[PDB]
Ligand binder design. Structure first.
Ligand SMILES: NC(=O)c1ccc(NC(=O)[C@@H]2CCCO2)cc1
Ligand SMILES: NC(=O)c1ccc(NC(=O)[C@@H]2CCCO2)cc1
Lengths: 304, 304
């Protein structure tokens, strides 16, 4: 028992992390097969970042200008291309530690593990969510760019995020491994304000299921609601509208606990309207929305 | 910027995890050099756990009764001994992936990463603290025993915890890698109630420093306090007494932020007495005590 914000084991991704240096900019690269993926802003000075023309900056760069180091060993760059906001650096050596992997573009509300890296060296691992405003709330200092977000299905790492920038509000924006930003963000140092950080309702409900499973049940009430009634309250509290898709996704947790999804909705409605009254749920004084139904099932059943 | 509950990268420890089976009991072992460490209760049936005589149960066990599997490969057990509450299984093969390592017995309030494992396969990594009552609040299902807690200093894994049992209250108890339980807990299925789960005051202050560093400053006030005055409030709120040792430990964060430790104490005193009033600090509605001053410095400076 017990319920923890749990990252995937990072070993498979540790084995992929390299240092990429272009001129005076050092950040992290992901080495899969004979390709190193990194943010294209590796080619920018701090000055460049104000109004970068990446195609033009990239013309002034050759294979030998990209310094790629895996541990203490230099990789030879035999090609480089720009795909959207990432650079793909072709190297002469396939990463021998390349895991089974996929590139996946995740939806808002989906969770993933970040391996925070500096100079291609892992510093730590934490779990986060693609926010509904397509930011993430990460922990990223200078040099952390090219750190990646991932999920693991048994032995297959699905890479879903590469870190690119911090908004002036200290939230984070990045790309999938095809170099496409999540949301409207650009790799330029400009006014980019995030939209409403709404709460991932389906994830809160999942976490309320996890709480019941793990003995935290004080918030279960005598009430039910409908999707429409619940959603009137959700809207009021900047919670994402709950869909029948979400209800269907919560079906297994509903089944396990014997609490109908709409009853858990009615409990969540009372928690929104009444607050927690100084009480906690799974050691949190606020409603946690960075567990997916899949995360709750995985953690509650012990998938490896 | 941003501040996350961050585990150490787990790769070095993933490479140490094995499955140990004795009869019908399967749990996890830690393979370092030619020794596999596992909870001695691997030799117990569920029946045995009510009143186990480990020396007597162990007599009925031979090397060939301990089934040790690293991935899909069986290890040959050439010796077995009991050290306190762990078994040391000597195997004929040194773990080729043995990292630099130490066994350390941590103090209450100290944080570490847990690699939750089932059948010797990692399921996830999370950060936790040795509580002042020598429990941990983990996430451990049946089969998770022998999962380990660790810190990393660059390339040296300090193993500080091996998971052994869940108290009837769903908190966790375990040993160091010498098999000595943290606190008064025993590997027997009995009435074992945890003491007062007091808040790790020095860790809260560290996390308040992290909050200021990362822009969350609404709780800074116009007041200061003394250690004695603060401690009267601490006692009232089941917070650990703050010592001059703790003040000295917070010195670097004090220096970085220019907020005197006793001023941060006075801010923490007001937060205890006045609550958060529906406000959050680093996305928490309660005072987080599972970051050490070292964790805050490490994460705020980007140590790898
Ligand atoms: N304003 C934009 O250019 C914009 C681009 C992409 C998205 N969608 C996403 O990032 C993820 C990807 C899967 C669907 O949701 C939203 C807005
Ligand atoms: N009642 C007991 O037998 C007991 C045993 C050990 C401890 N101390 C610890 O577990 C850690 C280890 C470093 C100091 O604090 C406390 C009580």
């Amino acid at each position: 028992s017990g319920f923890r914000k749990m990252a995937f084991p990072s070993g498979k991704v540790e084995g992929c992390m390299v240092q990429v240096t272009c001129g005076t900019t050092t950040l992290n690269g992901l080495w899969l097969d004979d390709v190193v993926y990194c943010p294209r802003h590796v080619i920018c000075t701090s000055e460049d970042m104000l109004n970068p023309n990446y195609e033009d900056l990239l013309i002034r760069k050759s294979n030998h200008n990209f310094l790629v180091q895996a541990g203490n060993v230099q990789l030879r760059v035999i090609g480089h291309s720009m795909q959207n906001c990432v650079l793909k650096l072709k190297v002469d050596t396939a990463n021998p530690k390349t895991p089974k992997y996929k590139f996946v573009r995740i939806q808002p509300g989906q969770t993933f593990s970040v391996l925070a890296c500096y100079n291609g060296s892992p510093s730590g691992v934490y779990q986060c969510a693609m926010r509904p405003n397509f930011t993430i709330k990460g922990s990223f200092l200078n040099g952390s760019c090219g750190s990646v977000g991932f999920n693991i299905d048994y032995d297959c790492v699905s890479f879903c995020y590469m870190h690119h920038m911090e908004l002036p509000t200290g939230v984070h924006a990045g790309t999938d491994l095809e170099g496409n930003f999540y949301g409207p963000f650009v790799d330029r140092q400009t006014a980019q304000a995030a939209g409403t950080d709404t709460t991932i309702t389906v994830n809160v409900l999942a976490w309320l299921y996890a709480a019941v499973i793990n003995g935290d049940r004080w918030f279960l009430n005598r009430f039910t609601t409908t999707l429409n009634d619940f959603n009137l309250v959700a809207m009021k509290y900047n919670y994402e509208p709950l869909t029948q898709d979400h209800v269907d996704i919560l079906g297994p947790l509903s089944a396990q606990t014997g609490i109908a999804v709409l009853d858990m909705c009615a409990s969540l409605k009372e928690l929104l309207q009444n607050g927690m009254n100084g009480r906690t749920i799974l050691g949190s004084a606020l409603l946690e929305d960075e567990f997916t139904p899949f995360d709750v099932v995985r953690q509650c059943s012990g998938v490896t």
